[PDB]
Design a protein around this ligand. Structure first.
Ligand SMILES: [K+]
Ligand SMILES: [K+]
Ligand SMILES: [Mg+2]
Ligand SMILES: [Mg+2]
Ligand SMILES: [Mg+2]
Ligand SMILES: [Mg+2]
Ligand SMILES: [Mg+2]
Ligand SMILES: [Mg+2]
Ligand SMILES: [Mg+2]
Ligand code: NA
Ligand code: NA
Lengths: 178, 220, 148, 96, 170
RNA sequence: AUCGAAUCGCCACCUACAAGACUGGAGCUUGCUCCCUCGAAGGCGCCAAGUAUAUUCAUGAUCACAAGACA
RNA sequence: UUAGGGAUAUGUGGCGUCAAAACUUAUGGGCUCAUUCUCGAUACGUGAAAAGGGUUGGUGGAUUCCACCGGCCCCGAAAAUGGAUGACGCUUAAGCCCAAUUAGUGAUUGCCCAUUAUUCCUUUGGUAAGGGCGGAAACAAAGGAGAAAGUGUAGCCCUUCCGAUGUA
RNA sequence: GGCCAGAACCAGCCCUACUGCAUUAUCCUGUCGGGGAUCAAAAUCCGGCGGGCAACGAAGUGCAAGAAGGGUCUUGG
């Protein structure tokens, strides 16, 4: 399945006024499900960093950054999440993916699973493709050995939806009730 | 056991010996709840179902977890009069029938008809052995339903530890059934082999265009 | 191209003359026949499906009760003009096997022409056998997934 | 429940696409009464006279994702004693 | 072990979805769930991600490196002759036959019915011959064992006279 | 003997069995190679007792429970 | 949020059976084992703390171990009729967090349920809105009939729009 | 026939089938240098430079303005 988050670059600024005639222009990476969310997150960052509210700002550009060609890579995701008990926790995790949006979506599912952290409490600081020799965790490093091979065991190969049956003769494929 | 009127009327009618459309399910290594749900839905759809080998149904978890579950169920009883209380059945086929009954609208006539369409056996009794090829329920089989690292229980063992007293009888009867069936299968190997060789030579005896037709549809 | 015109027809293109059809209802349900024409004013189809092969006589049938298959016999040499609506028009009763000689002769002529036309096609023996076969829905068959 | 619409499960029809194929087809529920009453072709074909009776309807639309179909019966709702009993789905009106 | 490992170069068949029953080569392993699949000789099989639940590992493995170039993949696949060997197997023929059955017309189904029925009839003929020679059918072996006894004790005088009288009566 | 019914796939080849972390067989290098029965069909049945030189079907008239059912 | 009826589509809530819906969806990622109190699936709300310890996550140091911080599970956790995630059951979940809509294919509506929404038909009432009402000309039996200047009736007749629940 | 049923057409609704415009660069390709790893490689990665359309149904990114098969016992003819 394709990643649920897209890679956005939102470019905006405070509206020029008499007190700020040539306001600074800010570039903001963010991984979001749609561009409305991406711009919402951009304005949150503008507010909490530059003290610029959305009601006094401009969106110069909001564009999806396309993913590169799909290659089995190692991804360093620098990510932070907030919880009431522990405040902000920042971690740097490694992931096997084929795109940056894939690695980031995987990181979000991972933080949701192992830390019960939801999307809006998560900030991604940096995602970066790294070489194999700079990979630190053995659970990621095992996957780039030259002779990597494994069988597929304990698999549940369900039939195609059209050919699925309720009752089947014990040692045949003869469907009885379907 | 038919009445004398039923036999006399059938004798008058000249009709042959009839058997309704019945599906026979081999429940060995089937997940108890999933098989029960599938069977219940098919019974509400009007199917006539006989299930065999209920003593080899499976439940996830260790045997002690599920025996303790059964004992918890067993202590439920109407204090002021245990007759008319919940009736706790110990036999595995009875357990499956109860599991299916709890998955039916048992207090309507429709649910009652559905429940009375189901026959449950331990082992495979002689009246069922020869009625036709038995079926499985793929979405309710242990080898695709349970991760094999997990412990699981066989229903007959739990039942015999909670009061079922027919475990050894069913074991001996199943051994005899398998021995008789395997003798009858080793014999008739020559008949099956004769039919296989007959089809192989029929290929060389039929017209050629028909052979090509079989080839393109994957039969030759 | 006039709706009032007898030539008006909205019949689906697969029910072309000469196409072999599966009869879905009526006396000859499951018999494969041959579509010869459609009667004027967007009327029913007429099928012979030569009575020698399957027993279907010259009969009219609504196209909502056939499966017109993609297998066809070229019947351009059959002369379906004498098959008319008046052929099946019947002078009814009043205060109340058997075939009129005209109907019998028309059956003979159409049937001879159709049998020759069928025998003139490649895999024509196979097509005669196909016209002799009976269609039935068997246990386990999914006709909604089939091509025809 | 709303009895004006019946749900029918057809053998070998296990996707919404198959049920789509069956949309518009004629549907029949065959049963018997106690007495012999009037049938179609009562005078023309007296061998049709029977306690047997049929109730007719049409498939209106699929139901769910797994091949179930909604059926509207002519004039009146199908009787609830038909629940769990056989239903005929014919191949006409045909589109092929 | 006889199980075909997931590895770089392994041929796979797509189990379900838009590419069901197509063949591709594993060119990279992402993680425990995902591999990169390409087959240069199938036009719908450009390099793409397949989940490992959706592939059948085959018994062939061209010899390529991970994240190999397209040219190396094509040259190795052509030299290894994996597609040819796979096509000569019966499961590939079964996939082809399923494809032909799916597209079959009514006349094609009738032709197949005729061919199967002709085969069945001819197998019946061969079986009847061999059954006459050496009995394995129920009726034939019953006939043999009851024939030994029928000819053992029909030579009786009363039996022969009764048989003659019955032949005369009819 | 009421009695008209609803039901629409047969089988003396499925109607034995076990395993799914190992499925026909080998080998040693233990996941690859070599062999085979090449690993994704229970057998029939669907209108000539079998694939062809055939042979009765109507008027039951265009849908109606198949107007018939020991395959 | 409500005239009484159909169709279509939703809301909240759901989609293993009960029970309509994934006939147990995916060609989605993780996590979790629990023995007489039953682990979990309990918005409101209807079963808990201080404190502590299996598994798999994080941070910071030392050479695999040291400390610290999360997730899920476990202990802490005792009441009186037999009993309650609603029941059965579920553990390649039918549990928890996250995310999809037939799936790295080629684009942005899977499905099921309302007295809601849209639309069609009928009723009834308006702070209702418009037309027609000077008989149009002719016309017997072996095209018919009606046409009232009107609050209210079987409402003069036609068209149109909107509302319609309710204790005292 | 003012009753039951089936097909045709019509009008109105309701489902189809068919998709163009803009955008991509944190991208695509060649070659130098490094860096990597094993028996040696290639690759994952980083900087340059020369070229560029990743164009299969390119991409699941923004907006789509594509007239006319099947449903109506969900309407009236
Ligand atoms: K609806
Ligand atoms: K009014
Ligand atoms: Mg006791
Ligand atoms: Mg009948
Ligand atoms: Mg349901
Ligand atoms: Mg599921
Ligand atoms: Mg509940
Ligand atoms: Mg109104
Ligand atoms: Mg009121
Ligand atoms: Na309310
Ligand atoms: Na999962």
């Amino acid at each position: 399945v394709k990643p649920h988050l897209r890679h956005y670059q939102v470019v905006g600024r405070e509206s020029p006024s008499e007190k700020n005639p040539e306001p600074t222009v800010y570039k903001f990476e963010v991984f979001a499900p749609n561009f409305v969310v991406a711009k919402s997150r951009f304005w949150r960052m503008m507010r909490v960093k530059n003290k610029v509210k959305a009601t006094h700002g401009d969106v110069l550009s909001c564009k999806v950054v396309k993913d590169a060609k799909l290659v089995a890579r190692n991804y360093l995701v620098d990510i932070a999440y907030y919880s009431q008990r522990c405040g902000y926790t920042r971690m740097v995790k490694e992931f096997r993916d084929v795109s940056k949006t894939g690695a980031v979506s995987q990181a979000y599912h991972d933080l949701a699973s192992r830390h019960r952290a939801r999307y809006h409490n998560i900030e991604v600081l940096n995602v970066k493709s790294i070489p194999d020799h700079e990979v630190k965790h053995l659970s990621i490093a095992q996957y780039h050995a030259p002779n990597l091979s494994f069988p597929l065991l304990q698999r549940r190969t369900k039939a195609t939806r059209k050919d699925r049956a309720i009752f089947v003769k014990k040692n045949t494929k003869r469907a009885v009730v379907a | 056991f038919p009445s004398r009127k039923d036999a006399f009327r059938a004798q008058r009618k000249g009709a042959k010996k009839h058997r309704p459309e019945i599906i026979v399910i081999d429940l060995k290594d089937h997940v108890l709840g999933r098989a029960a749900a599938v069977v219940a839905k098919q019974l509400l759809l009007g199917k006539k179902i006989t299930v065999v080998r209920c003593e080899q149904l499976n439940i996830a978890g260790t045997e002690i977890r599920n025996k303790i579950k059964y004992l918890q169920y067993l202590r439920k009883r109407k204090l002021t009069n245990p007759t008319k209380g919940p009736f706790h059945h110990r036999a595995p086929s009875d357990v499956f029938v109860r599991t299916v009954r709890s998955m039916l609208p048992r207090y309507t006539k429709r649910g009652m008809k559905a429940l009375n369409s189901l026959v449950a056996y331990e082992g495979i009794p002689p009246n069922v052995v020869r009625t036709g090829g038995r079926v499985v329920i793929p979405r309710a089989q242990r080898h695709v339903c349970y991760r094999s690292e997990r412990p699981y229980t066989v229903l007959g063992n739990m039942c015999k530890h909670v009061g079922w007293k027919y475990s050894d009888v069913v074991a001996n009867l199943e051994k005899a059934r398998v021995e008789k069936a395997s003798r009858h299968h080793e014999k008739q190997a020559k008949l099956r082999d004769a039919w296989k060789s007959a089809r192989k030579e029929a290929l060389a005896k039929m017209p050629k265009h028909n052979v090509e037709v079989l080839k393109k549809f994957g039969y030759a | 191209v006039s709706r009032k015109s007898p030539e008006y027809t909205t019949l689906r293109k697969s029910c072309a003359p000469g196409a072999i059809a599966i009869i879905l209802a009526g006396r000859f349900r499951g018999r494969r026949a041959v579509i010869l024409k459609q009667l004027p004013h967007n009327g029913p189809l007429v099928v012979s499906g030569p009575m020698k092969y399957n027993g279907v006589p010259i009969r009219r049938i609504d196209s909502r009760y056939v499966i017109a298959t993609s297998t066809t016999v070229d019947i351009s040499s059959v002369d379906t003009a004498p098959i008319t609506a008046e052929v099946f028009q019947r002078p009814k009763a009043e205060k109340p096997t058997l075939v009129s000689d005209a109907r019998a002769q028309l059956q003979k002529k159409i049937d001879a022409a159709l049998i020759a036309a069928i025998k003139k096609d490649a895999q024509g023996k196979e097509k005669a056998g196909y016209l002799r076969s009976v269609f039935t829905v068997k246990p386990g068959d999914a006709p909604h997934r089939w091509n025809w | 429940q709303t009895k004006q619409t019946a749900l029918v499960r057809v053998e070998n029809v296990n996707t919404r696409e198959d049920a789509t194929w069956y949309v518009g087809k004629r549907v029949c529920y065959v049963y018997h009464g106690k007495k012999v009453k009037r049938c179609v072709r009562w005078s023309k074909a007296p061998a049709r006279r029977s306690t047997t009776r049929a109730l007719w309807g049409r498939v209106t639309r699929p139901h769910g994702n797994a091949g179930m179909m909604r059926v509207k019966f002519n004039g009146a709702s199908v009787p609830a004693s038909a629940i769990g009993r056989r239903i005929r789905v014919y191949l006409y009106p045909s589109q092929i | 072990v006889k199980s075909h490992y997931i590895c770089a170069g392994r041929l796979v068949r797509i189990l379900r979805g838009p590419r069901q029953d197509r063949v591709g080569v594993i060119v990279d392993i992402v993680d425990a769930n995902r591999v990169l699949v390409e087959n240069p000789e199938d036009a719908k099989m450009w390099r793409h991600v397949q989940n490992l639940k959706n592939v059948e590992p085959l018994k062939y493995c061209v010899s390529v490196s991970r994240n190999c170039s397209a040219k190396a993949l094509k040259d190795a696949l052509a030299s290894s002759k994996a597609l040819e060997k796979y096509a000569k197997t019966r499961t590939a023929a079964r996939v082809e036959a399923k494809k032909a059955c799916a597209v079959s017309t009514d006349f094609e189904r009738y032709q197949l019915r005729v061919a199967r029925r002709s085969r069945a009839h001819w197998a019946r003929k061969v079986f009847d011959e061999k059954d006459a020679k050496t009995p394995v059918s129920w009726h034939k072996v019953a006939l043999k064992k009851m024939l030994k006894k029928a000819a053992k004790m029909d030579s009786t005088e009363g039996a022969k006279r009764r048989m003659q009288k019955a032949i005369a009566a009819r």
